[PDB]
Amino acid sequence: SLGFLGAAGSTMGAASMTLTVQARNLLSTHWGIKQLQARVLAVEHYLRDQQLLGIWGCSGKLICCTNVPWNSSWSNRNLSEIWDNMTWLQWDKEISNYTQIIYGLLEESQNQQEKNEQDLLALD
Amino acid sequence: SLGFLGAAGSTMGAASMTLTVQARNLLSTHWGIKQLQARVLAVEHYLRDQQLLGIWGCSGKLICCTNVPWNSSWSNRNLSEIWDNMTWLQWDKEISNYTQIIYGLLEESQNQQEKNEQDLLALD
Amino acid sequence: SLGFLGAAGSTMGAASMTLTVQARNLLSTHWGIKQLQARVLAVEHYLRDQQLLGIWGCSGKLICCTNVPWNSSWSNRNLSEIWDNMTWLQWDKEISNYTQIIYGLLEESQNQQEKNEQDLLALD
Amino acid sequence: NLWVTVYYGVPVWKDAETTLFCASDHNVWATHCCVPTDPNPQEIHLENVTEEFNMWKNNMVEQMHEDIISLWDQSLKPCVKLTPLCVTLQCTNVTNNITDDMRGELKNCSFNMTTELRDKKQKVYSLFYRLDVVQINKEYRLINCNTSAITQACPKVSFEPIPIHYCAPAGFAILKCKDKKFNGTGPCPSVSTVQCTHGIKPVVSTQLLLNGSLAEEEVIIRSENITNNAKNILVQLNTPVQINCTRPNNNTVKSIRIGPGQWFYYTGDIIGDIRQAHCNVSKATWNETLGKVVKQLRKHFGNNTIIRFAQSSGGDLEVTTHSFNCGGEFFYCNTSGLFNSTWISSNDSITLPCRIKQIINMWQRIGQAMYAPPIQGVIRCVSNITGLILTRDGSTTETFRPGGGDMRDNWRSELYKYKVVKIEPLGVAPTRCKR
Amino acid sequence: NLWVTVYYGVPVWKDAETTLFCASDHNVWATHCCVPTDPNPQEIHLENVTEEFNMWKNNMVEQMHEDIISLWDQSLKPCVKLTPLCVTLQCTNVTNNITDDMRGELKNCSFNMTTELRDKKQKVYSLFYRLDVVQINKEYRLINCNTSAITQACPKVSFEPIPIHYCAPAGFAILKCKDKKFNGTGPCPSVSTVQCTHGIKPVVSTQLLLNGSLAEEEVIIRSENITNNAKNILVQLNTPVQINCTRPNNNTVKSIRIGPGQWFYYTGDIIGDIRQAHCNVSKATWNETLGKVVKQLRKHFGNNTIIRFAQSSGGDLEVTTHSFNCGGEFFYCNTSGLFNSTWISSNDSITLPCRIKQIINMWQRIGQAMYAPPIQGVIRCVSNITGLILTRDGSTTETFRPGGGDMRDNWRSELYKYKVVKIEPLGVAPTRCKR
Amino acid sequence: NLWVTVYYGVPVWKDAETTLFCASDHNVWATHCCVPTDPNPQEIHLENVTEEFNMWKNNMVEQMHEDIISLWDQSLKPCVKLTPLCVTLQCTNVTNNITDDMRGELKNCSFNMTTELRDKKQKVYSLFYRLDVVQINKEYRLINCNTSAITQACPKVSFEPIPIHYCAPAGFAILKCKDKKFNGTGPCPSVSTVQCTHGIKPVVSTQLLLNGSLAEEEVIIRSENITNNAKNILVQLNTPVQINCTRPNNNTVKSIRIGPGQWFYYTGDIIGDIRQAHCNVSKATWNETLGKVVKQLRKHFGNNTIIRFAQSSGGDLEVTTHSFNCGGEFFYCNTSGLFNSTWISSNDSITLPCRIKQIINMWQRIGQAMYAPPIQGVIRCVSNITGLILTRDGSTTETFRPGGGDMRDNWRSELYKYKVVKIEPLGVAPTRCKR
Ligand SMILES: *[C@@H]1O[C@H](CO)[C@@H](O[C@@H]2O[C@H](CO)[C@@H](O)[C@H](O)[C@H]2NC(C)=O)[C@H](O)[C@H]1NC(C)=O
Ligand SMILES: *[C@@H]1O[C@H](CO)[C@@H](O[C@@H]2O[C@H](CO)[C@@H](O)[C@H](O)[C@H]2NC(C)=O)[C@H](O)[C@H]1NC(C)=O
Ligand SMILES: *[C@@H]1O[C@H](CO)[C@@H](O[C@@H]2O[C@H](CO)[C@@H](O)[C@H](O)[C@H]2NC(C)=O)[C@H](O)[C@H]1NC(C)=O
Ligand SMILES: *[C@@H]1O[C@H](CO)[C@@H](O[C@@H]2O[C@H](CO)[C@@H](O)[C@H](O)[C@H]2NC(C)=O)[C@H](O)[C@H]1NC(C)=O
Ligand SMILES: *[C@@H]1O[C@H](CO)[C@@H](O[C@@H]2O[C@H](CO)[C@@H](O)[C@H](O)[C@H]2NC(C)=O)[C@H](O)[C@H]1NC(C)=O
């Protein structure tokens, strides 16, 4: 089963097999203004993450690999450790300091890719 | 050329040729609140359909083919009966008891498909 | 560099280099109603543009090359005369009179493309 | 062999309950709160679509009811509270130039009221109808003193119904039944889809429906369960009956200040003599109207069944008389003269006497009351009777009486042909197409 | 060698503050206005996840506090205002048929009230508790006349707490601490994810906590910083202590109309022998309970330290005595009999000499008073003591007292197990996939 | 042989009207209502962008006006109403220590006021400034008694303007005009984009604008139509003119209780000589300022003409006289000393006498009033004149008079550099790329 956050605590390698279950759990007087605000926020957060996936060229996919190389300065660990001995909570603590850098690189990479596709098509 | 729900009553294979005509109409003192809640609700329904298409790998397509086989236990008719005699309203009623099953299968299929592509791009 | 609309006024060619700069700034008591009413608009406008791109066959690539030919009756400037000697504001003022025509053509060609893909995959 | 193909934009809907909004284009219904109506609304015919409609199980009716109550109450929010008016009132009869039928109808009353300054009092007098005062055990009080505070309606605001168009939110649609003779509950073979309803006028009346829609060809009799005497029968008409109503008295209106920013309006006196309020219908037209009604009732109750009409009885004026707003004034007319006949197989008018009331308790609620300011001069209006509310009493003779109460039925009649459904654009079907 | 891969739907979260909503399950908590709950569909146990919880830094607690107050005020919004009662009262003692335990507790007062007609007055008699009546210089006024407006609570709206479940907004999740012997601030080795908290009954009390949850293994002491005598100590019990509270007198309630549509309810008379309100706690269980509390305090203070329980300090009745709403009336009880012992290295019961007050100024807000209508009949409540609020005295002996009054702490008692986190579905990781 | 290519994120826009929200940066503007401003807003210069601005069609002004009225009214919602004060007053003149500047401008009134107990009364003595008191036939009433009730402003809430920043919602942006010497209606060659405006203080005044922005280099004269004699002229200044205003009287504030939970504040007495309120400007500075105004007016009306400044035309004090809020006090000052000069092609002050009024009818509305509580002690404030509002009377000497009273003219004097545009990120263009 393991609904919602049930995979938390498992290694990253195992946790990647449950991405779908947490995707479908996103996006769900004076008192109503509290419920209405909550509904709006859920939508805004959902859309901002989708916007990034669109910008980076991932869009509707759950898993996307890109052309941005991994820098050892962000983290220098063996794949056999990160994907079998650290959890997605632990990893976040370790990589957090570099995620703004990474996101900027993902955006630039996609922009370069789009220009290249437009030119190749023009060249037929 | 009809408009909106005007295709209802036509055969399934006829109605299916005009999907954009309806897609365009999605998203198109509490009198303030009633109007605001209605706008929020319209967005929420829109987004749930789009998320679901995204999970299945059908984002942005209108017509999307999959790898999940059709079961005779859900329905068993000749394709000519389904596409040439029946309409969509009749069909939806006939298979209303299998939509949860089908959706679960589509979600499983796409998740496995994404994993297989991730491995191929790493050259196995 | 030149955040948000800073490239406005530059020629169309140069301006197209920063499309993500503007795209990323989209969406981003009685009184509390003015924020809810503002947030909902930001979302509806965002979604309507995204829906239109989706219908046209552009899931969101920023730059989508379509299969609809350009008509000289809309504009007969040569390409340098458009891309090197004009900005986007000027361009939009000139093309505005024909944008409903163009949009209709884009939706129509996409429906034809969708049908063709579905049939080829029945033969595949 | 076959695979599941996903389609989006599919012409499928399911019955649904959602919130509708108004679109319409100094007003009780605060129509400025609505969006404007689109000058070119669309309607599309849905050939080969047969849908089941049920006017007796329809949430559009309930929302119209709720919106009308709220709009009505909201228009009294900024108006004067006549709490200084609930005093011992000293009254005598108006005996000056009285028609026999108004002997002791109208009364003359004296008050000690408040003024602009709190230390002062102003002695005033006014004329009241008997219906709004109750004896103290010459000492009278207003009828609302032992149930509610009364709010004076603001004089600039009109009570004339303005058509309100109801519109569905995106993702929803309103289906409409165009089937002639549709009785509101069966399958409807001919439908269309609209985004907005026609404008519906929130006309308020009992027994006889005014200014509604007419049937194209014949009288249609609609009921939830025709054999259940606890249910009302709504009879539409295919012809209007013209009714001419009046308040044939030239009233002079006076006003006083009762406190800072507040004033009270009342009838000061009447110029000339007086006459009883009344309504006229043509006798011949009324006889044809009933003949059509009787034929349709016989189809339901038996060819040789005798159909009899009778006056209603029991309850307050709202369920025994024909109440309505005319000229902004509130009328209570006696329809006994219309419903007194038994049916087996040149300027002659029918005159219905009417009373006038100023303290109005609407929507059958308690704890709220409105004071309807008097209107200067003489009042006349002409309206069309477009349907009846009848109830069946309970072998040989079936007796029908005028019914009333529960405003939902007036709205139910105009909305009988509309249904709300939700669009479900996503679905699947088997095809030969894979991956 | 390695490239960045983006994953969406990643099982991570961050601490966050968001707005929670009511899901609930004639009440002052507007329980009909909440989306209803489901039948506790699930909780997800999270294996190998240890989170840090901090009950002293918790926005769920602050939101509950604010929502309870808002609901409270809304429930009085449509109720009768009692402004006309602020008059000079003429009062004499009620010493007729008393036991002399109550001598001076009740007074028989008379006054001139407004009525339906504003030009009339009606002299009435009623009984008042001494706590609500203050001598002006025989001439008395209500205690609230010089500080606040007073509104009568609606007689048809109940103060019986209904469990309210609090649910996460979409995009958020509530983590619950399952571990036993969790003291509120450290890591919690075993947690689970829920969408809604259990329903919490918003019981209002001081000194002792009533109708909360029980600890299962041991009495648990929780405080933010136990070495700081400025902090309160919350003690959670393993067994309930059953407490019976009554008002032995049979009261007759009368109702007077004080203006159009409004009436005031007041004690008319008392049928019988006037006796003191009181509440019973069995000694065997209370003495056992204190011993258990002391053992846990000794773990923190030393075996060789003497622990003394003492009664409260002087101050406002609301904070020096136990307080609760029983049968609709507000009781204040002297708990000294429960905290009078020194601990060193039969149905015999404790009786608490309780008193009743009708004028209420809750949440310590000045300017907002409520009148508690009298209850017809005799009042009996049985409730469970599920915890204590203790304060620490500022060498060899420590003293603890029944302090309290800040409602936020009552909520901390049940909300200590929950934390709200934001779900953060995106993240990146290195891998061998390129494109 | 080109194809349509779709671009998203295109830097274009259209004129649009949307809802703006406030962002701030014990106050009547309720700045806690606004979203706190980020300490580092960005401004993005747009090279090669020329846009048309039209300050007279700028709906940002209308929104600011509505927000100001709304905030103003909300701040009075919970304050004490003074209905009990609209009683006959007995008044004599205060002649006891008059310098003849104030002879006839101050009266000593007494009246019968309510108390917490509704059956008691108190005799109150208070001082009024004549403008607030009108004769009935020594019998006076407050001027508001025959229009509306008056609400006392809450004494703890300041009226001092706080800069309010306005912010556009996502999808919209505000373009700002950077050109110097921009008159508000033509093209602006140098612009920048901002998300939020600078903070604008909602300073409320007539005739002379206080504490606004200054012109960059020279006086700028702006008008909707310079030849339309029905339009106002907004003259900005490139230099401030200092103005020193005072109420040089030591006021002792007294208060009484008027009902449960409520109190009224009034001036009790004045210590020392009673003197007229006044404002000072430098004569030389003022004369230099007009010379600059005159040169710029000549550019529009001819350099061979005569410009004459004259007094306001008469009518209501709120229009004909300069007004401002100083210390929370409301001043009305005579500007005839400033606009009395004909211009033909050492520590000398100008003193403007002022009047004080406590009953304020703001925003030119009828039916609302505010009572301004007295201020303890002596009031002094120093402010900058940053622009004038002039009108022009219809080969001749032109006459200019003070104008204003329409608050949109004050806002529009700050919101002239900003316009709101909708971002339209989606569009198409031809290229060689096809698919
Ligand atoms: C929590 O940690 C334990 C190890 O202490 C995990 O247990 C192992 O799970 C794998 C399956 O992935 C089995 O093949 C091993 O045999 C188990 N080890 C032992 C000692 O039994 C457990 O799965 C972890 N919990 C989660 C949610 O991942
Ligand atoms: C309603 O049903 C009729 C059939 O009963 C549809 O008419 C047929 O349309 C096909 C395709 O164009 C023709 O080949 C047939 O000859 C037509 N039959 C008849 C009897 O006319 C009609 O189009 C349907 N309505 C809608 C809106 O789809
Ligand atoms: C504003 O316009 C000027 C031209 O008047 C642009 O400057 C030119 O840029 C091109 C491309 O780099 C050069 O080849 C020219 O030599 C430049 N001309 C001059 C006179 O410097 C300028 O870039 C434009 N601004 C923006 C934001 O696009
Ligand atoms: C006003 O006229 C009514 C008649 O319409 C008088 O009321 C009648 O009084 C007699 C006793 O004298 C009763 O027997 C009748 O039953 C009463 N009729 C009604 C309808 O109430 C009334 O007394 C007159 N009042 C004044 C002040 O003249
Ligand atoms: C309205 O017309 C429908 C027929 O369309 C009548 O419905 C039938 O009622 C009988 C008796 O209850 C049922 O046994 C049938 O099954 C119903 N038929 C259908 C198609 O629903 C209905 O009674 C009529 N109502 C009125 C007031 O005339």
Ligand SMILES: *[C@@H]1O[C@H](CO)[C@@H](O[C@@H]2O[C@H](CO)[C@@H](O)[C@H](O)[C@H]2NC(C)=O)[C@H](O)[C@H]1NC(C)=O
């Ligand atoms: C009403 O009750 C009060 C007590 O609440 C009586 O006053 C007390 O009288 C005794 C002497 O017998 C004094 O020692 C107390 O100090 C008094 N207490 C207070 C609070 O005043 C009072 O005499 C009783 N009056 C009547 C008429 O019975």
Ligand SMILES: *[C@@H]1O[C@H](CO)[C@@H](O[C@@H]2O[C@H](CO)[C@@H](O)[C@H](O)[C@H]2NC(C)=O)[C@H](O)[C@H]1NC(C)=O
């Ligand atoms: C509740 O238990 C925690 C342990 O989880 C105690 O916290 C430790 O207290 C010591 C006291 O010096 C600190 O130095 C540690 O940093 C604290 N943290 C942990 C995780 O050990 C806490 O004091 C206990 N609460 C009470 C009231 O005793």
Ligand SMILES: *[C@@H]1O[C@H](CO)[C@@H](O[C@@H]2O[C@H](CO)[C@@H](O)[C@H](O)[C@H]2NC(C)=O)[C@H](O)[C@H]1NC(C)=O
């Ligand atoms: C509070 O009241 C309850 C009953 O309402 C008491 O519990 C009961 O005690 C009697 C003996 O006196 C037993 O016969 C009952 O069986 C007990 N309760 C039940 C029904 O289980 C309780 O003792 C009282 N508490 C105190 C301390 O007075």
Ligand SMILES: *[C@@H]1O[C@H](CO)[C@@H](O[C@@H]2O[C@H](CO)[C@@H](O)[C@H](O)[C@H]2NC(C)=O)[C@H](O)[C@H]1NC(C)=O
């Ligand atoms: C209060 O002062 C006013 C003037 O400010 C007095 O009224 C004036 O009296 C003089 C004669 O001394 C007349 O010439 C003026 O025309 C009067 N002015 C007005 C407006 O009538 C007034 O009499 C004084 N009242 C009291 C009680 O002292």
Ligand SMILES: *[C@@H]1O[C@H](CO)[C@@H](O[C@@H]2O[C@H](CO)[C@@H](O)[C@H](O)[C@H]2NC(C)=O)[C@H](O)[C@H]1NC(C)=O
């Ligand atoms: C403000 O400045 C603009 C120019 O920036 C003036 O606009 C001109 O007005 C005349 C008379 O209507 C027109 O014939 C010109 O074509 C306008 N020029 C432009 C560039 O628009 C405007 O009149 C000035 N306003 C005032 C009050 O003087």
Ligand SMILES: *[C@@H]1O[C@H](CO)[C@@H](O)[C@H](O)[C@H]1NC(C)=O
């Ligand atoms: C790796 O990161 C460092 C900064 O931590 C930077 O100087 C270096 O250029 C980066 N290298 C690559 C290949 O991105």
Ligand SMILES: *[C@@H]1O[C@H](CO)[C@@H](O)[C@H](O)[C@H]1NC(C)=O
């Ligand atoms: C008005 O008050 C007087 C007493 O001053 C009383 O005699 C008279 O009857 C009252 N009149 C009315 C209509 O209440």
Ligand SMILES: *[C@@H]1O[C@H](CO)[C@@H](O)[C@H](O)[C@H]1NC(C)=O
């Ligand atoms: C009304 O009555 C008066 C006597 O009070 C009489 O002179 C007048 O003519 C009457 N008016 C009518 C229209 O009968």
Ligand SMILES: *[C@@H]1O[C@H](CO)[C@@H](O)[C@H](O)[C@H]1NC(C)=O
């Ligand atoms: C029975 O009813 C029919 C109409 O349905 C009518 O034509 C016929 O004359 C009637 N027969 C009688 C009189 O019973």
Ligand SMILES: *[C@@H]1O[C@H](CO)[C@@H](O)[C@H](O)[C@H]1NC(C)=O
């Ligand atoms: C009621 O009013 C009368 C007026 O004569 C007064 O004498 C009496 O004392 C009042 N009684 C009370 C209890 O206020």
Ligand SMILES: *[C@@H]1O[C@H](CO)[C@@H](O)[C@H](O)[C@H]1NC(C)=O
């Ligand atoms: C107060 O009321 C008394 C009558 O009770 C009256 O004589 C006196 O003049 C009033 N006082 C004032 C200032 O009007």
